[PDB]
């Protein structure tokens, strides 16, 4: 692909998302998603192989269906309020369709089947956009319509996401499928605290993006896409295995690492609202996530898997990958708990 065309298509993806965040009119919000899907698909088809074609097609079919439901919600909201403002919806049926449309876009359970497959079928760089940047626009809308969202619907999707994400990640050896099911589980935490304190939804999203972007950057550095491919990293870049250990432990929510902050703050807000059974269930179910992160540390950093002879040839060359912001991201993804009160800037 022409480098200029890649840059233009990349900026169109951002423009679609930015239109959704600055739009106060529902029509412009819908235009943002349509522009975002129009530009994302060519980046999925970049390598032009059958798996990338299937991933793009499954992604297009799911996103297109969600945008239809979102437009139905907008029009129904128009019939019952006579205005297009991006605020609380004025009809229960409009809220359900918009909530479900935003759930399909996010890949929440039970609308999750595409996330594991689309991520596997596209390169690591495209997958990073799929699991970090594509979550900003739908989360922007949920942040503004949460007063009208049915509590049972949103909490049901959150609980199913935490369960399916944890279970699905146990039976996986592909890193892109592991990161895909991890993403679904984390969506549950963002939307579970949404009815109670939307600020903590932003905190978990920001921390999830930083940690997720760190993992893909380190997988991109070594061109590793499988557990066993990542198991050779200790024999090429020993430092990279320590950074993967610290980040994976952070993603598992273990203190004193950064990734414990979003769980800690989400439990606080839910317990203030006398929600005790759900935070306890969510925290315990999250141990499923920590298990298949621990399984990656074992085969990556804490043990030394068998190597191959040709690995000795890789010792004579440096890492030429850009690895942009990796030294900064890995630090922010591991040592930020002492700065937790800085979550107030998000308010």
């Amino acid at each position: 692909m022409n480098p200029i065309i890649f840059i233009i298509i990349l900026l169109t993806i951002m423009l679609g998302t930015i239109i959704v965040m600055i739009s106060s009119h529902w029509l412009l919000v819908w235009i943002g998603f349509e522009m975002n899907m129009l530009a994302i698909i060519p980046i999925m088809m970049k390598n032009h192989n059958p798996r990338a074609t299937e991933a793009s097609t499954k992604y297009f079919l799911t996103q297109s269906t969600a945008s239809m439901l979102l437009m139905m919600a907008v029009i129904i909201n128009l019939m019952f309020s006579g205005q297009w403002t991006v605020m609380k919806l004025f009809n229960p049926m409009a809220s359900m369709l918009m909530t479900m449309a935003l759930a399909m876009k996010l890949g929440m359970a039970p609308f999750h089947f595409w996330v594991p497959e689309v991520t596997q079928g596209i390169p690591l760089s495209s997958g990073l956009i799929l699991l970090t940047w594509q979550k900003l626009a739908p989360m922007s809308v949920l942040y503004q319509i949460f007063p009208s969202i049915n509590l049972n619907l949103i909490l049901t999707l959150s609980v199913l996401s935490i369960l399916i994400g944890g279970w699905g990640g146990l039976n996986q050896t592909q890193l892109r499928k592991i990161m895909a099911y991890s993403s679904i589980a984390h969506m549950g935490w963002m939307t579970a605290v949404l009815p109670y304190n939307p600020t903590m939804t932003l905190l978990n999203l920001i921390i999830y993006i930083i940690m997720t972007s760190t993992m893909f950057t380190m997988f991109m550095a070594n061109s590793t896409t499988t557990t066993l491919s990542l198991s050779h990293t200790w024999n090429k870049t020993p430092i990279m295995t320590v950074l993967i250990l610290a980040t994976l432990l952070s993603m598992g929510g273990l203190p004193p690492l950064s990734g414990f902050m979003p769980k800690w703050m989400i439990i606080q807000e839910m317990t203030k609202n006398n929600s005790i059974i759900l935070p306890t269930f969510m925290a315990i179910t999250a141990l499923l996530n920590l298990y298949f992160y621990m399984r990656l540390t074992y085969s990556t950093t804490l043990t030394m898997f068998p190597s191959t002879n040709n690995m000795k040839m890789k010792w004579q060359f440096p890492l030429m990958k850009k690895m942009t912001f990796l030294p900064t991201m890995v630090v922010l993804s591991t040592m930020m708990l002492p700065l937790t009160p800085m979550l107030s800037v998000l308010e």
């Binding site: 235009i31 899907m37 088809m45 269906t65 239809m68 437009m71 029009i75 019939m79 594991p116 497959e117």
Partner: protein, 98 residues
Amino acid sequence: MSMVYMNIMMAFTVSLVGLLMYRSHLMSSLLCLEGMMLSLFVMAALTILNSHFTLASMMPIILLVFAACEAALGLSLLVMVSNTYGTDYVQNLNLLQC
């Protein structure tokens, strides 16, 4: 909510149920997406024309503009699916496992 809104909203539901129940052809499902856009256009045009919401009269046109982009985008993917398997069957799109 006149009796016309019933049929228009039923048309959307029929096209939605049609899109969620694939038979074999990817092209058959693409028609259901274009059918759903038609229902939304008609439903939006009716509400706007009936309430004399003058400035909203351009919204249905802007709704067709982005329906064509999606329709063209869906056709472009259908070309590449056909070039890889010789048909537009959706059962061939199963190399990626959940």
